[PDB]
Symmetry: D2
Subunit: 116 residues, 4 copies
């Protein structure tokens, strides 16, 4: 699995479950093309978005629907979403974990990139 | 001043100076409309982006050019940029400080929202 | 003012007001010696802890009473406190801002160190 | 495994490997008693610190030797270490993951607490 996303809740100290996200890849015409989508599991993780063969070099965007997560808990959060945009596989294939740690008025995000 | 952005560097322990950013407002057709731009000062801050009369309710986006910042320091970055998207003034005008704490493979962002 | 502490609340999107903290200097026998204390202002800041002549080289600890902060807001916290330990002035006097961004189950801390 | 620690490097986007840490438990006399120790693996994780039977209610401290990690990379970091202090198992047994995300002048820490 070359691309995995993990989302955590900093208020309750838990995985952020059932968080929707969409992944896009930048095309030759510089537009954003849909690439994959899914929702986080009970562990806060979303696996199985792509394969090594499909996940070619390019600029990718992960848009995480953090607002709907908070709204379902009764909270009106600051951010409309959390977007993570990055170039992938520019030096050959790598495995990417994108993590996001959520609070109502803040988020952190980090990438763990490993060589298979 | 209703909108200020502050950027810090977690590698050097310093303000992030000369970081460029652009601010957009969401248009009726879901496109991003130019609104303001600037670069951070020696204190890591960008002031004077808008006025209280111009800064009406709506969805706003701040795109911070973190990649150029790290490249100018000779450090390899992960992200293409750091985007912050939020709805402003939905409960009356507020003063917004958007802060971003930058590392090459991670960033944090938070909002400090105060009522004058 | 060579040492300032700023505390922010990631749940409310606000300065963390009335947060108590104590500062210690490490003694020759490896024990922590009282140095200063205070509580954050309406801007989340605590100034005036020491003077340039008193703030000599050494190892310092700031213990921030985050648990009492969250309890006073009726929110369950994870940590007993947030401690920041650092060596000061090892390359000449600097001005230190210690910042902490608080959530109930997470915190971030960073230092902004500038040379006058 | 009721207590696990994970350490990540925000500069390189990688696990922080071979990071030493010591865990302490507060005794009846309010002193810190050694509880466990270890170093992070190639995945940045330290498992096997304790058992459900031994990991009784109490206040625990994890002291992560972040300074030695940075110094081995040639870097003089801000913090002497990163300490995480928390009450555990006050409402019955739980499983704790303590994570720390490291930069030279900043760290973040969060807890994921689950019910077995
Ligand atoms: C309101 O203005 C400021 C905001 C902030 C932060 O948001 C912050 C963000 C983080 O991820 C971690 C942290 F410890 C602080 C830091 C400083 N500072 O240090 O000067 C400010 O003046
Ligand atoms: C990629 O794997 C993980 C990443 C992360 C973070 O990004 C993280 C973010 C922060 O602001 C602070 C922190 F201490 C960790 C947290 C966990 N975790 O808790 O299990 C992971 O497994």
């Amino acid at each position: 699995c070359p691309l995995m996303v993990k989302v955590l809740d900093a208020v309750r100290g838990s995985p952020a479950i059932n968080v929707a996200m969409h992944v896009f890849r930048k095309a030759a015409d510089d537009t954003w093309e849909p690439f994959a989508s899914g929702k986080t599991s009970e562990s806060g993780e979303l696996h199985g978005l792509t394969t090594e063969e499909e996940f070619v070099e390019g600029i990718y965007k992960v848009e995480i629907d953090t607002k709907s997560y908070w709204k379902a808990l009764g909270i009106s959060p600051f951010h409309e979403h959390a977007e993570v945009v990055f170039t992938a596989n520019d030096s050959g294939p790598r495995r990417y974990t994108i993590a996001a740690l959520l609070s109502p008025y803040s988020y952190s995000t980090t990438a763990v990139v490993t060589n298979p």
